[PDB]
Enzyme design. Sequence first.
Site, PDB file in Angstrom:
ATOM      1  N   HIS A   1       1.020  -1.189   0.040  1.00  0.00           N
ATOM      2  CA  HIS A   1      -0.126  -0.081  -0.107  1.00  0.00           C
ATOM      3  C   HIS A   1       0.812   1.299   0.044  1.00  0.00           C
ATOM      4  O   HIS A   1       0.507   2.451  -0.484  1.00  0.00           O
ATOM      5  CB  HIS A   1      -0.950   0.122   1.214  1.00  0.00           C
ATOM      6  CG  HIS A   1      -2.241  -0.862   0.830  1.00  0.00           C
ATOM      7  ND1 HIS A   1      -3.457  -0.936   1.481  1.00  0.00           N
ATOM      8  CD2 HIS A   1      -2.261  -1.971   0.010  1.00  0.00           C
ATOM      9  CE1 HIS A   1      -4.080  -1.906   0.944  1.00  0.00           C
ATOM     10  NE2 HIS A   1      -3.538  -2.526   0.204  1.00  0.00           N
TER      11      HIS A   1
ATOM     12  N   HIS B   1      -0.729 -12.526  -2.369  1.00  0.00           N
ATOM     13  CA  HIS B   1      -1.553 -13.482  -1.734  1.00  0.00           C
ATOM     14  C   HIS B   1      -1.339 -14.875  -1.592  1.00  0.00           C
ATOM     15  O   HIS B   1      -2.004 -15.648  -1.260  1.00  0.00           O
ATOM     16  CB  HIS B   1      -3.058 -13.338  -2.446  1.00  0.00           C
ATOM     17  CG  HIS B   1      -3.603 -11.905  -2.329  1.00  0.00           C
ATOM     18  ND1 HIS B   1      -4.656 -11.566  -3.186  1.00  0.00           N
ATOM     19  CD2 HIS B   1      -3.237 -10.868  -1.740  1.00  0.00           C
ATOM     20  CE1 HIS B   1      -5.030 -10.315  -2.831  1.00  0.00           C
ATOM     21  NE2 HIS B   1      -4.115  -9.875  -2.029  1.00  0.00           N
TER      22      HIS B   1
END
Lengths: 714, 713
Positions: free
Chosen positions: A78, A245
């Site tokens: 992020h 992920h």
Amino acid sequence: NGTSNRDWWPNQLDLSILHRHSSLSDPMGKDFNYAQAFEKLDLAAVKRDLHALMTTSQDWWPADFGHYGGLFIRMAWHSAGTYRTADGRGGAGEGQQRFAPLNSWPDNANLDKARRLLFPIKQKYGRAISWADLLILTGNVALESMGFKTFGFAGGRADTWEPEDVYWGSEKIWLELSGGPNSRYSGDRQLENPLAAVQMGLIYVNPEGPDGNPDPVAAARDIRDTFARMAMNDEETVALIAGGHTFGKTHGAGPASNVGAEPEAAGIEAQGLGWKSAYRTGKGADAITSGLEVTWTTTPTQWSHNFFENLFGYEWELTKSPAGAHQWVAKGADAVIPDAFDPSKKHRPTMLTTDLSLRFDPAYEKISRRFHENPEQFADAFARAWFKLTHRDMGPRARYLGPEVPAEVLLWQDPIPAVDHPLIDAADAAELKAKVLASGLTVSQLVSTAWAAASTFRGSDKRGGANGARIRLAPQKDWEANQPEQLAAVLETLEAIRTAFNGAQRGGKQVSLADLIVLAGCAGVEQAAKNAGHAVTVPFAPGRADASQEQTDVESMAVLEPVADGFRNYLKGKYRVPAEVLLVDKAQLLTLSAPEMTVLLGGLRVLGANVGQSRHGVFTAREQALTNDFFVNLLDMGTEWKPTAADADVFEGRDRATGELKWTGTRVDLVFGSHSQLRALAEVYGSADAQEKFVRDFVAVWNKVMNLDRFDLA
Amino acid sequence: GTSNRDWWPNQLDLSILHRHSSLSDPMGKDFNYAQAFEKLDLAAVKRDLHALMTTSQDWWPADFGHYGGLFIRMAWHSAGTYRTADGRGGAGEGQQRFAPLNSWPDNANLDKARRLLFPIKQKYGRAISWADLLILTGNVALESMGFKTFGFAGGRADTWEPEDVYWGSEKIWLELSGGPNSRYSGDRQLENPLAAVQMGLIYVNPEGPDGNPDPVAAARDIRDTFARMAMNDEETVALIAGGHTFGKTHGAGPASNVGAEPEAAGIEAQGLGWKSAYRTGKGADAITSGLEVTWTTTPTQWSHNFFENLFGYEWELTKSPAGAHQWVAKGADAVIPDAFDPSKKHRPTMLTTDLSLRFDPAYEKISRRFHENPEQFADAFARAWFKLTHRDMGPRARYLGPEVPAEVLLWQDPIPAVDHPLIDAADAAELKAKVLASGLTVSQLVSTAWAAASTFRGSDKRGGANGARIRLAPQKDWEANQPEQLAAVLETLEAIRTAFNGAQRGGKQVSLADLIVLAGCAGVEQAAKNAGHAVTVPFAPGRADASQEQTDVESMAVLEPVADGFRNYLKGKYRVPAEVLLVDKAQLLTLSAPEMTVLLGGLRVLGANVGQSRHGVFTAREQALTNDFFVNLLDMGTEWKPTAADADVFEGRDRATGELKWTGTRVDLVFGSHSQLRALAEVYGSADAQEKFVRDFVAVWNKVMNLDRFDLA
Ligand code: HEM
Ligand code: HEM
Ligand SMILES: NNC(=O)c1ccncc1
Ligand SMILES: [Cl-]
Ligand SMILES: [Cl-]
Ligand code: NA
Ligand code: NA
């Protein structure tokens, strides 16, 4: 509640974006140099401490699986993930995740916890490691801790001390879905430039699907478009999402209504944290971050090839998390995924809609299958992509610091060859300026070409500038703003000068075209000053090198095209944003203050730097002479101005007593006579005591622009 | 685009501390306006202004062929935004040329007046600031019309961006009182710090309170607003009658003819506004206020005709051509000249607020005295005009040029001249040692010097340690100053002073004002020593001691700190949050956010809190200059919660045991909450920061001690 000038006049231009980041708001002294601090940090020591932190669970935010690595990878992703190639704004390079608004974006929920966990390390090393470097280094150590070998790391991201002024959108509701009064979409799902996220407060896309509709194929369209707006192609995109992920989990243990105020809204007792949850213990097993409840792999704290085994190995059913969010569960699977806190619980494999995109979009499915069949390819791709993601806004490789910088030069870095020959000295510079002025090239042609070459720089991601002589290459040579036919004629004359000079040298001394373009521009400014009766020598620093076409990714260069450059009174098309706002935006990218913007523009107008030799703003009868005529004539109250009936964005200036037409100008020209702060600056430069000041300030700002990308000399 | 202020509209605003950077200033870093001004040919500027007075421009024709009334209004309005509560407003920064004041409804058509002056500004360039030129122009207008001014001082350097000032919370220009953001409560009580009745007015509404044309009621608003601008009844009467000796109002047609104010106007308007569709839009057709009054029979010449007309006629309520309430003389002949047609004359007229000067009983006494004795009127007006236009200029040491009045006025908070040799570096060292041997503590020394110096505010350049006014009424008895503790410190220092001055030769002596500041310097050195650090704090002598007779006690009252977060002090319960009041005080002190942060964290560990409160004293070595405030504030091992007794006081407990460690207020804990302030706290709380914290503390302390030292410019 006190009413401000922005309340009364909400569409007026904002100049304070040019005077942010003063030495007033910076706690470090004027002479602080972060590179020099960093270069004496014991980077290996910091890495040991970060490794230790991974499994040092704090009871106020207990570590999932006993390991903070996934939380820290998300944090670093992020930090970098706000980047937009349109303007270079966002990214990890200023550590802006710790300021508003990004510290409080819904997609950054609970990353306040992640940053807090790092303060004891920050405190221990102090100024020698910035927050900005620390957030990326932590993500790298998280990956290494969990068994993934990274491609490298560079330090050198200096901290900043206030929020950046960035357009994130016009919506007034967090996460608003498309089609509202301030929609960022129009047409056939066309996202407005310069944005690179689908909803206000998201990093790229919505994990449930477009506007919440759980269609993996439609989601893949949003993934592709936003990732491309963040400089990533299909291979990089798949690598990054699947790579990320591989680790950790999402958090959605109860309804989202349990989660309280984001950090900037929270009470003073929260001491900078937010999103306090009333659901059960509010943390750990009970955590609520996105509202989804997905754990991708059978070893969420270890690098594996389990992501793609799961994606392809099961068929998927639509289901809802405990918060009500759309997500997918594997049909008929056994409970093979570990629980984050209870060793007696196991879970079926789960996926987000946007993970399913990697299998159901046909282009992604080919790459995903390749990575499933060839896991070494996946690992290498993910390592390269992670480095690119986390360094995309760092600028030339000359800025990269420390012992872990990759030696491999990457095309995306816009690389500049090393110089391996003596440079031109002052006597040589004088000889070349004379040769340029004896060639017949005009002041207008010399100034315009150097401006075109140097003014592609933007400080947001430190791309562009005159180093590399990319103005001679595709696509810069063909940009309309660059006047392709004029440019080609100037470059042919300069390349003949160059060839002649280089052929006469001994030793290996030679001058690059990049340096000659800039030097020739400097000769034009000197000639212009002479034309005005002023004796001025303009500073010049050699050392730029020429990059090749093969070192120049043409599609990546496209975003640097000036579609609005008020400094050359150019606007490629009609935009909804007013031209004077685009001028302040460009000045911010060039790192200019308002006085510098003002002086630069008024000088360029009288030097002939307008595209097409437009007379708009050319408020002089002695063009190609460096004078303050722009300001003296703009401020003359003997002229009345009115928009034209043909075009409301072009204005005619007439003699107030006779009606006689004296000048024409655009919004960018006339703002200097209209905006109360800009007009105050114009009055200084248009005063009878100001000609020599104007010339000297013009030369200083000109030199500044010529040197913007010269981190070889930092 | 949505901004942080949009998302979080109540969050604190630090950008008010970071204005006026060298980024936004076009002049070089080394430009010194006083040096430029001192070489201006001021006489030549005045001759050009004199000629401008009667050189009409056709884009804004001069009433009566003379711009003097317009320019007096322009200068009055430049000065007239001043408020004594906070010192903000006034003419000293030339802010009339920036938003919002350039576009206030009460400043309508003063864009035209400033525009008329650009040729002169252009000719003289950086040698005369806009700020000084607006005032100078008003003086030359007065002198050209036959009025002797009291003097003029230059020295107001130009600024380059708007000031951040609270002007009110209304969202509609000129909103009448009683709305959702009313600036009135109770029995017509105007909220502090405001000094005008409606948003966008200078003082009062010319038609009467909220438009009600009652002169008696208007007088109460006049008295209140003008007192909030530092003027008493005599000065108020002199100013209004003085001003309204000249020129006229403009209200030739309906106000719906008048278009956008300057900040709203199109780009083609080139910084002007209020373009009017009524007839020619100017001159005889002008519309500014919407009133149509001309007060005297000679609007271009000083006279005593304002009061002859006020008292010589009875008055009838009437409406202008724009529909505004105004007054006309009953039975009068047409004796007032028209501004453009030499064949037309008009009856005398007055505003509701002019009639206040006759119908308020206290005003009437003054007005009758000035009517009977117009030489008294002229003298009061010249003094009040000087005060108005210089009230925010600061100590007389800032005053430049050849027309500075020699008379010292009580309102200047005057400082006597020094006429003896000053102490040198070895003397200062001797006195620092004598102070530390007296037994005065670090807390006493720091707290007394803070008390003395921190009354400075850069808004109007009042306050500071010069003068040793801390020993006089009223400062000596302010609660935040800890009157009994202070008296004990001052007696000890006055005994040191007496001993040192009695031992000297050659007339060398030290003032109490300097010894207070030096003693504080000794305290900061001692605290540093207590921490293991040898440092020398800079000190510059040359302060003098003012007397009680040279101190206006009532004017001093507005300088009392009712909120001083640097001493964790709040005199009572306010609507505005204490952290916001801390940033307001920092702005007045001229501090940046880093300077505020260092200074506060240091004061907390030195024992500067009023009353020895432990709130924010996050150290176990009080009176040692360390960064312990920051290291302890940032310790995540401590959990903070508001107390049940007082929601504005917080307890810091050990997160694992619950043991009480500390207490703090909102001012303490904002440094751990606000995202920009916490970033600063982290720098000063890091393990490499001891040395830096000490150095930066000494530098901001020395800055505070010297804020009023314009004698060293
Ligand atoms: C289409 C793009 C992506 C979407 C929609 C997306 C969505 C999400 C969501 C919804 C979460 C859960 C947050 C929470 O509830 O705690 C998350 C977690 C995470 N994401 Fe992504 N993601 C994307 C791409 C990325 C990329 C590119 C990386 C890194 C290379 C990444 C790494 C992670 C990690 C490591 C976690 C786990 C955090 C934890 O263990 O606390 N993601 N992602
Ligand atoms: C109760 C306080 C006062 C009120 C309500 C008030 C009101 C006004 C109004 C409504 C105008 C007409 C604006 C226009 O339509 O052009 C004006 C004009 C003027 N005022 Fe005042 N005023 C006050 C105090 C002062 C003071 C203190 C001075 C200066 C010492 C001053 C000097 C002037 C002058 C010279 C003009 C004439 C402008 C011209 O000729 O263009 N006034 N006043
Ligand atoms: N918003 N941030 C920028 O535009 C930028 C940052 C640093 N230097 C130039 C521009
Ligand atoms: Cl940014
Ligand atoms: Cl102000
Ligand atoms: Na950026
Ligand atoms: Na002021």
